[PDB]
Symmetry: D2
Subunit: 275 residues, 4 copies
C-alpha cells in the first residue's frame, strides 16, 4: 500500500510527526518539589541539547487517581503552575502536563504548551470539549482498554470542537489481569485510523520493570513513530509515584544516544509496498 | 474455608447483600423521554411487585462518554431529576443513576436513592470523595481494566471519606481487543477483597448479544450474589444507546421468574468447606 | 431465537446431551496405584448411585506433557488398562481416558467406553482420524487457545472420518499469561457451532484454586450443559499431578447433591425467545 | 544488571546467537511442488548471498493440524525429503523442517540440519525425547498459550535427553479470541529463562496481515535477537496454506536489506545497566 502522509503538530518550533526525528516528551512523574523539578529539567535539557533531540518537559501537578485519599498527590494546580513557570523562564523549555477536570483545562493551557488527557478520562466528552476549547496542543493517553483502531473517534471529537492539534500516546493494552502488553502492530493501525496524527510511546507506563525500558523503547521506535514519553528520577525507588518503572536519571544520556541513532536509521528507510 | 459474613447495604427498606434474595437494579439505558421512562418503570414495578423481587429503577440522565460530541446524551441533570421525581411520586420507586463530575453528586443525591460511579471514573479520587460526602448509597461499576482483587481499595477509599454504603458491580473484563468476558471466579474474589460488600452483576454491559442475557444472568446468579443490573427497552434496536444489549421489555417477566427460582435455590445451598 | 435440538451421544445406557440430566465424567487425575483407583472409583459409584447421577469414571494412564522427562507419568498403557479392566469388572463402571498418539487409540478403545483427545493435540488430524476409526465415543478437550466458535471444525473432522459420537469439553481460555478464564457465553456458542453436540465442563482444569470448584461448577451448570468433568483425591496436596485443583474426595457428596438440585432446576426452565 | 552471555548453536558454519548477526530461517509454508521449492530457494539464496545474511531454508513436508481431513497437507515425508535433498545438492543450503510424531524425528534428522517442534506439540515429552535423541539442532515454536518465563523447562527437557542445541522461536501469544500479540518484553524474559539460548522470531505466524511484516520484524529485531523466521510465496493469495501472512517473494530483497541495516546497528549498541 502507499505510504500515507503524516500530520505535523507544532509545539512551538518543534514539528512533531511520525516521519520526523522523534521528539522526547519526558520528565518526572509528579512535581515532588521545586528543587527536584529543577534538577531533573536541567539534566534533560543539557542531555537533549547535547544530542540534538527535540524536547518537551513532563510532570504532573496532581495525581488524581491514586488508591487512597490521604496518599500524596502533588503540589496541586496553583503551586504546580508556579514551578512550570520557573522551568520555562529558567530553561526555555516547552511543558506538558495532564488535566483532570474541565475547569483545569484553560488555567493550565495558560501556562503549558501541551495539555494531556489521561487514559481513564479519554472518552469524557465534556473534558475533551473543554480541552479542545483552549486551542492548546493535546496529548491523548490511549486507554489500556481501547483497541488501536478506535483512536480516530478521539481525534474526530477534538476536531468537532475546533482543535486539530492532537498527539496520541501509546501506553499498553490490557493483557489478562494486572499486566499490560504493547501491541507493536497498533502503531500502524493508529497512524491509519487517525489519518496520520503523530503517535508517541509512553514506555514508562507500558511497563506497569524499568530495566526493560531500553528494549521496549527500541521496539516501539523501530515502527516509525513521532516520539517517546519517559519518566525518570535520580532514585526511582524513592519516587513518590510509579517509582518502579522510572528510568534512573543518570542513565538518560546513554539511553537517548541509542534512541537517536536508532530513530535516525529508521527514519531513513524507504517505505516498502507490500500488498 | 469458612463462609464469611456479608454486609447489608439498605436502599430504604431493601436489604442488599450477597446472601439475601437478589435485588433488581434495572431500567433503561438513558432517559429518552418522560413517557418512555413512565412506561418502562411501570412495567418493571408491576412485574417485580408480582414476582416478589426487590427493585430499584435505573436510568442515566446524561451519557458523558459517547464517541461524538453532537451525539445524543440524554435530557441532562435538571430535566432528568424532574423525571426521577415523577417516577418516585407516581410509583414509589427507589432510583439509581450515574454521576460524572464532583458537582453533580450532591444535587443528584438530593433526588435519588443510589448514586453510581462509572467504570472509567472509578479511580478518580475527588469524585469518590464528593460522592462519599453525600452519604448516599453508592454503586461502583468495576472497571473493565481492573482485577477483582483490587475492589477493596475502592471500598476503602469511600470508607476513608466516611461512606460505608458501597455496592460493587461486575460489568466484564477486557478479553483481548473489543470483547469482554465475565470471570465467574471474580465474584468470590470480590466478596473476599471487600469484606463481604454486596456484589451485583450488570449483565447488559457485560454483553458488549442480548439473546445471551438469560444464560449469562443465570451463570452469575449461580455464584451467590446480591443483585442483577439490567437495561431494557420496548424495541432495543431503536434504543438511543446500547440498544444491541438491551433486553426486550416484553420478556422481563419470564426472565425474572427464572432468576427468582434460580436465586431462591442458590440462596438455600449450605456452604461447602473445601480446603 | 428458537431452542435448537440437542444431539444425544450414548455411553452405553447413558444418554449424554445438553438438555438431559447432567452426566458426571469424573475420577482422579492419574492412575497413581490400583488401590487408590479402587478407593476413588468406589466412592464415586456409591455417591452417584445414591444421588441418581449418570457416571463415567476418569483417570489418565499416562501424563504425556509434564515439564520434566524423569517426572512421574503414570503406570503407562499396558498396566493402566489392567486397572480399568478391574474397575469395570468390579464396579460395572463406564470408563473415560485420554490418548496421546495414533497407535494408542484402538488398544485403549478396546478397553474403555470414551477416549479423550487432549487440548494440545485437538487439531492433530492424524490423531483425530485414528481416534475416529475406533468407533468409540470421543471427548474432545477444547484448547485454551481456541475460540468457542471453532468447535464445529473439530466435530466435522471426526464426522468426515466416520465418527459422530463427539462430546466437547470446556476447560478455560487463555486470559493473559498463566491464567485461564471460563467464558460462560462460550457454552451457547459451542452448542450452536456444533449443531447441538453435548458440551461438558472440566471445572478442575479450568481452575489452573480447588476451593472455587463449587462456585465455578454452579456457574457452568447454570448455562444448561450435558455434564461436568471433575478430578478428585483423598488428599489433593499429595496427588501426583494437578493436586492444587483436585476436589477433596470426602466433599464429593455435598458437592454433587447441590449440582443435581441446580441441574434439575435449570433443565426444567422453558427456553425464552429473545431477538 | 549485567549483560549475560549468549549461547551459540551452530547450524553447520552458521553461529546462531542473540548477540551475533541475525540468521534468516525462511522459505515457504509447505512444499507445494518441486519447481516452486526450487524457485523460492534460489531467490532466497541469491538475495542472502548478496546481502551477506546467514541463511537456512524452511518448508514443511506435512501440514498435520489443518481444519479438514481431505484438505491439502503437503507431499508427505518420503517425497518432501527428496525435494530437500535436491535443494541441498543444488544450492548447498541448510534446511529446517517440522516434525509431528516421534517416528518422523530420525528419518528427517538424517536429511535436514534443523528439526522443528510445532507449537501445539512443544510440551509432548516423548516427542521432545525422540527429537533430542537425533542429536539434530532443534527449533522449538513457543506455544501461543505459554508465558515466556516458561521456556527454560523446554530447554531443560532437551538437555535431560542429551541435546543442547535448542533454538526458541517467538510466534505470538493469545490476545483474547482469534488474535495474537507479540510481547516484545518476552524476548528478554526468554533470554534470561533459557540462560541465553538463541531466540528467533517467526514474524509471519505472529501475524495470524502481511503488509505489517516489515513493521513487526523491525520491532522484534530491535530487541537484539538471534534470527528471523519468515515464509514467502510469489503470490501469497494462492499459497496453499497461510497465504494471508506470507511475504510476497519479490519484496524479499528490500525487506532483508532493511533488516540487515537495523540488526547491524542494534548489535553494535553497548548494554546499558539499569537497576
Amino acid at each position: 500500500s502507499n505510504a500515507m502522509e503524516h500530520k505535523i503538530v507544532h509545539v512551538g518550533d518543534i514539528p512533531v510527526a511520525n516521519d520526523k526525528p522523534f521528539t522526547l516528551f519526558a520528565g518526572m512523574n509528579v512535581l515532588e518539589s521545586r528543587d527536584l523539578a529543577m534538577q531533573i529539567c536541567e539534566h534533560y535539557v543539557k542531555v537533549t541539547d547535547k544530542l540534538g533531540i527535540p524536547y518537551v518537559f513532563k510532570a504532573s501537578f496532581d495525581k488524581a487517581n491514586r488508591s487512597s485519599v490521604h496518599s500524596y498527590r502533588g503540589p496541586g494546580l496553583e503551586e504546580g503552575m508556579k514551578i512550570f513557570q520557573e522551568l520555562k523562564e529558567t530553561f526555555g523549555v516547552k511543558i506538558i502536563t495532564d488535566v483532570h477536570t474541565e475547569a483545569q483545562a484553560q488555567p493550565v493551557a495558560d501556562v503549558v504548551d501541551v495539555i494531556q488527557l489521561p487514559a481513564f478520562l479519554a472518552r469524557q466528552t465534556d473534558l475533551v470539549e473543554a480541552m479542545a476549547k483552549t486551542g492548546a496542543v493535546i496529548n491523548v493517553k490511549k486507554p489500556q482498554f481501547m483497541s488501536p483502531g478506535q483512536v480516530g473517534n478521539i481525534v474526530e471529537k477534538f476536531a468537532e470542537c475546533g482543535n486539530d492539534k492532537v498527539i496520541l500516546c501509546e501506553r499498553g493494552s490490557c493483557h489478562g489481569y494486572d499486566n499490560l502488553v504493547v501491541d507493536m502492530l497498533g502503531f500502524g493501525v493508529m497512524k491509519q485510523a487517525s489519518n496520520g496524527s503523530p503517535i508517541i510511546f509512553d514506555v514508562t507506563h507500558s511497563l506497569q520493570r524499568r530495566e526493560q525500558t531500553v528494549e521496549l523503547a527500541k521496539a516501539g521506535l523501530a515502527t516509525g513513530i513521532a516520539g517517546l514519553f519517559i519518566e525518570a528520577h535520580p532514585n526511582p525507588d524513592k519516587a513518590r509515584c510509579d517509582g518502579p518503572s522510572a528510568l534512573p536519571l543518570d542513565k538518560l544520556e546513554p539511553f537517548l544516544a541509542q534512541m537517536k541513532a536508532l530513530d535516525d536509521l529508521i527514519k531513513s528507510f524507504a517505505h516498502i509496498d507490500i500488498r
